Each structure stands twice: as C-alpha cells, then as structure tokens.
C-alpha cells in the first residue's frame, strides 16, 4: 500500500498554488474590492479568510496527507456512512471539466489572434460590426472589443438560445483540442510529469503579472485606478452583502474540499509539515489576487484618464474583463502585440493548472477505489478527455456560450457547498476533531491549536451555511443579456446540480441497508473509521 510520492516538494507546492490561483484571482477579486469599499473590503475578506477558507483549506490538505487515498476512498474510510461525499466531489469535478476548459480554449484563440501588427479588435469598420459599435465601452453602445468577442470569435449573435447551438466553430474546436492535448500530456504519467508542467503553468503568471504591473504603472492615469481599487470605505463593513461576497470569494478562490487538494496531498510523505504548506499556499493565493488587482486597475485608470471612458463601464467581472475590456486597452498602448500575447498566454496558464488539479482529483480518487484503472491510467484519461472534447464541441458552437453559462451556474455552484458542508460535519462531529487532531499530531509532531479546532467545528459550518443561504437568496431564473432561459433549462440545471448531492443520502441509504444488525448497530459500524 506504499503509493507514489512527489518527486520534490516544490512540485506539490506549485501544484497546489497552480490549482488555487486561476482567473478568479484576476477577474473577480479586484472587482469585489472596488465594488465593496476598496481597501476596506480587505477586512471582511481577511477575517473570512482567517476563519473560513484557510481552516477548510488546511483540513482537506491534512485529510489528504493522512489517509493517502483519493476522495472516494478517503471519505469512505474516514466515515463509511458519508462515503458518497467522495462520489459527490468527483462528479462535480467531472461536470466542471465540461465547461471550465473552454475558457482556456478562448485564451489560446486570442493568443493565436494576436499574431498581427494591428490587433483585430481595435476598429469598428470590420465585417462583423454594427452601427452600435464604438471604439471603447459606453452606456447605450457596444465596444469594438465586445463585438469582436461576440459577433466574430463567439458568433453568439447567430444563436437564438440554448436550443439553437448553431454550427461548429472549428477554429474553436481546434483550440479546445489543443487544451486537452496539453492536459493529457501533463497528467497521463501522473505527478512525475504534472509536478513539472506546473513549474511553467504556475510560474509564468507571476512573470506575466510582473511586467504587466510595470507596464500598467508606467501608464498615465494608473494612480487614478489605484484610487478606484483601494480607496477605503468602511461603511461596507457594516453591510452583510460585503461579508457575503468576501466569504464566497474566499471559499471558491481556495477551493477547499473539492477533492483536489486532497488528491495532491495524498501523494505527500506522511510526516510532511502540511501545516506550513497550507499557510504558505493560502497567502500566495491571496497575495496573487492583490497583485493582480493593481495590474488590472492601473490599466482601468489609464483608460478612464487617457481614453475618456467612465470607470463604471470598465470595472467589470468575469470573462468580459479579460476578453474585452483589458485587450481593448492593450491595443492602444505601444508594443501592443507584446502585451497581448503574454496577457493571453497568462490566463491560459492561469487556467491550465487549475484544470490539471480538477481532473487529477477524479483520476486519483478513482485509482484508489478501482485497481482496474490504476493499472490502466493513460487509457482511462484518454477516454475521459475524449468524452470531454466530444461533449465540449457543444461549447464550440455558435451558441456555445449559452451551454457554458448554464453549467457555470448550476453544475458545481451549490453542490460543492453542501458537499463541503457535510465534509465539515463528518470530520468535526462524526469523526471528531479530537481524532483529527490526533492524526495531525502523529504526522507533523504537534496537534492543531484551539483556534483551528473551534473553526473546524463551529465557524466552518456557519461559514459554509452563510454562503449557501446567500446564493439562494440572490437566486434569479437564469438569464443573460436579454436572453431568458426556458423553464426546462433551469430544470435540467437543477438536475445536474442535484445529481451530485443526491449521492450523499443515496449511498447512506445503500450502505445502511447493506449491513447487518439493528439501526443503532448499523450506525456504529458506518460511524467507525477504517483504522479500527
């Protein structure tokens, strides 16, 4: 039962760093600072990070290093009753792989489109333009970079909905194929290779962010953007919505209990100081977001100053920020081509390693439960990634964005919250904090302080619950621009969302009715950990 191990610590580290740090650090965090009181937003963010994210981040890492098994097997051994958690985590990782990768596909596309002396998204006098086009963002109009991304790259204008996918963009399907080719030849041999591919995919963003910080700061109006970014407004502290955005951001940006930190840590050495790893990584992740914030907003200010665009029209979130707003500014500065190529190469590498960790969560969680595939890795993941690409062709259609948007709002959003909720409950109340502290002490030599124990037991459930409730309060029937989804689209969405969580009681019911004795006796057995 002696499994493989990381061929060097840094591999594991960069793997965890890579997984944690993605486009969210760029296209979501700085917007939330802006929206919620600038520098003042760092307070609920920090506190939520200190008592919510990091404890959970830590917890899963320790669970990984301790049990030496993937999600399904680990949770099964931790608590036989709540083994379905492992399954719930694996399929969530499985669903996300269907849509998350297309973002990287868009990244490479722009990277290939930036091999020109004049970037194709500057002007409004192209074949794909409309009279509503203007050179930059403006209320009541569309921007040249928007119409490029929409009417040309996406050809979204030709779809009337999710029922009408339209034709297949073969320039896009190609990019998606390339993504999976990279994904395959990074993961097919396991951590012996992926532990090296992360040396590029996790380090390049810091190289890129650096020369972009420099380029962004040297631009006129940069300091104005810094003001929009971090001007304190402590009135936001009193707002519950700010604490909610802080909590949600911390959770999804660290991704604890997603079964990937678990997977990566399962390959660690038993007596490894995973505590230092949790702290170091967590910091680097948030530090990266902070850095990226200056990077984004220095350019945003330059736009609002030397291009005469309202700050309200440029300070956005999500793919709109990095596929439209930022390239729009890039194209106006000298050596535009250079900045364009590295910016796109960046958010490609920002996505790749995250995609690595997501898939590896699945493959690892499976090899530990089914020796059939552990013997046959390459074949399995070739079959898996092929399934990805085939279904992923739907994302490469003219209405591909509608498919992407549906999965992004249903597949993993709610499911992983109620999975990780049961994760915290099982660990801190069924398996016990005392037993967990004991495990950690055996590994790293010392037990967790009372701080971490109180957090895992009391703060963490309230944390996760405060978020789940929050996302449900602000629910709205799925829409995008003027396109409103049919009732059935939301129905199928909740099925995909529920196909995960349904594993929690389904297996609980299954293993309950699969053991002998009485009800109190069934529990006792399905409560006893594996080491017994």
């Amino acid at each position, epitope marked *: 039962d002696e499994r493989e191990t990381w061929s060097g610590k840094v591999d594991f580290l960069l793997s965890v760093i890579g997984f944690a740090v993605d486009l969210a650090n760029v296209w979501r965090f700085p917007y939330l600072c802006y929206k919620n009181g600038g520098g003042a937003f760092l307070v609920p963010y920090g506190i939520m990070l200190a008592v919510g994210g990091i404890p959970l981040f830590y917890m899963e890492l320790a669970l990984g290093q301790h049990n030496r098994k993937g999600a399904i097997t680990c949770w099964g051994r931790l608590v036989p009753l709540f083994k379905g958690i492992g399954y719930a985590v694996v399929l969530i990782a499985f669903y996300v792989d269907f849509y998350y990768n297309v973002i990287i596909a868009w990244s490479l596309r722009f990277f290939f489109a930036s091999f020109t002396n004049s970037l194709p998204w500057t002007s409004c006098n192209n074949i794909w333009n409309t009279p509503n086009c203007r050179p930059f963002e403006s209320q009541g109009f569309q921007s040249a970079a928007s119409e490029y991304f929409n009417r040309y790259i996406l050809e979204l204008n030709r779809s009337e909905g999710i029922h009408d996918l339209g034709a297949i963009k073969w320039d896009m399907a190609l990019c998606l194929l390339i993504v999976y080719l990279i994904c395959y030849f990074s993961l097919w041999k396991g951590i012996s290779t992926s532990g090296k591919v992360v040396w590029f995919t996790a380090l390049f963003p810091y190289a890129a962010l650096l020369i972009l910080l420099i380029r962004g700061l040297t631009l006129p109006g940069s300091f104005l953007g810094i003001q929009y970014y971090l001007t304190p407004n402590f009135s936001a502290i009193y707002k519950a919505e700010v604490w909610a955005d802080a909590a949600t951001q911390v959770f999804f940006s660290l991704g604890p209990g997603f079964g990937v930190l678990l997977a990566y840590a399962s390959y660690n050495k038993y007596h490894n100081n995973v505590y230092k790893d949790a702290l170091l990584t967590s910091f680097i992740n948030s530090a990266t977001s902070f850095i990226a914030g200056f990077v984004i907003f220095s350019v945003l200010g330059y736009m609002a100053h030397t291009l005469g665009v309202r700050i309200e029209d440029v300070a956005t979130e999500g793919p709109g920020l990095v596929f439209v707003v930022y390239p729009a500014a890039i194209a106006t500065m000298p050596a535009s081509t250079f900045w364009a190529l590295i910016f796109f190469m960046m958010l490609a590498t920002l996505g790749l390693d995250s995609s690595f960790g997501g898939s590896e969560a699945i493959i690892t969680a499976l090899s530990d439960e089914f020796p059939k595939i552990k013997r046959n890795r390459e074949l399995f993941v070739a079959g898996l990634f092929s399934l990805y690409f085939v279904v992923g062709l739907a994302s490469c259609t003219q209405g591909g964005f509608y498919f992407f948007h549906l999965l992004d709002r249903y597949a993993a959003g709610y499911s992983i919250l109620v999975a990780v909720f049961f994760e915290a409950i099982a660990v801190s109340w069924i398996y016990g904090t*005392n*037993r967990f502290s*004991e495990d950690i*002490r*055996d590994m790293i*030599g*010392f*037990p967790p302080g009372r701080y971490w124990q109180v957090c895992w037991r009391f703060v963490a459930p309230i944390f996760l619950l405060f978020i789940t409730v929050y996302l449900l309060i602000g629910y709205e029937p799925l829409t995008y621009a003027d396109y409103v989804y049919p009732s059935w689209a939301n129905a199928l969405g909740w099925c995909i969302a529920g196909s995960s969580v349904v594993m929690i009681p389904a297996v609980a019911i299954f293993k309950l009715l699969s053991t002998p004795g009485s009800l109190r006796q069934r529990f006792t057995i399905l409560t006893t950990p594996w080491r017994d």
Partner: antibody
Amino acid sequence: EVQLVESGGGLVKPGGSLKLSCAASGFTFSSYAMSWVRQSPEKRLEWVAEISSGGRYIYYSDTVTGRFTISRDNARNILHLEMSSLRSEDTAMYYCARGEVRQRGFDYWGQGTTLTVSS
Amino acid sequence: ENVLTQSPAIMSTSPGEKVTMTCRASSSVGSSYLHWYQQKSGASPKLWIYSTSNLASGVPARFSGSGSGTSYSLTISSVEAEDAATYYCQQFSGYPLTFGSGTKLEMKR
C-alpha cells in the same frame, strides 16, 4: 497542579508479568500523548513506549516491542504498561512522562516506580 | 536507532566557570526535535532546553543550547552550585526515541 504518580513495580523473576500504572491529575489527560521512559541503575535513560491521546497511535522500542503493551484509560485518567516475558535488563526506574508536542519533549515526569527483574 | 553520545561523561566544575557539554548523534536530527533534560540526585528528570535553544520554564538564563544536524551542545555561561546534576540530551525526531549517555556536573574544592 500537574501531577503524575507511578504505581506497581517490585520484584519479578524472569519470564514474569507485571502491570505498571501512572495516575495523572491537573490537566486534560485525554489531550496529551503519554510515554514510558525507564532508567537503568547506571542512571541511563531509555524510552520504552509512547501512546497517543486517543490510543490510536502506539510506538515501542526495539528492546521492548512484542513483550510490553502500553494502554490508556481517559475515563479514569490512567496510563498503563503491561509487561510480560520480563528479562533482567528490564530492571529500571520506570518513569511516566508526557509528550504531546514532539518539538517540546517530555515536559512532565512522574516520581517513578522501581522494577527489579532478578532470579 | 539513532544513538546519542554525550561528552564528557563526568565534568568537574567550580561555580563561576563557563562550561559546554556536547551531544553528538549517529544520524541527523532536526533542530526542533532535540531537547535537554536535567536530573538532580534522587529526583525525576525535568525538561530543561527544548527545541535546541528554547529554555523551558523556570530555567535560568545562564543556560543555552546550540547546534544542528549531528552536533549539539548545552552551555552554562556561569555555573552555580545549584547546577550540580546530570544532563541528558534527547531526540524526538524519529522512532525509537533515544536519550544521550548523559553528562554529570560535579563541583570542585
């Protein structure tokens, strides 16, 4: 406030069996890994066995493994050490010491109890 | 096992002297896992210097520890008469746990 008292111990012939005990008081006994450390008559310390706070992690020395059995009772606050196949080398002052944090060593030692293995 | 060897076995010292007893290991030990104990005559040992350099509570400032890898040492800046005891080094790095042969302080006259 913290107090450990070793009991048992005495004269035993080779192959004999005896069970040592250590009563703890002044702290949450169920939160600290306990350890038996013996001291030969030439005033030389030798670690015997360690038991985790929940008894789910046991470690023995080479000269003791397979013969001694360390045990815990978190209900009545008692560290146990059942010995069997006692050889003359086992003759020592057996100390009950606690060591939860490996990076801090044994912060508290009992008064000790004497075991003599002779024919 | 990782055998710790302490020298000197017996050390003769008059109060006011600066002394240094050494603790050598057969295998490398992490600086946070090597500890020192003091044992008076007819008494149970007490934790003296944990994690190489850190003094345990009640331990006077005249005591200190240093070293790394396979070579550590306890130093008494200015010996007092009350420091007449035996000092044992111990590693908590790997199992089985091992103590040093010990070094005994004796007074001169």
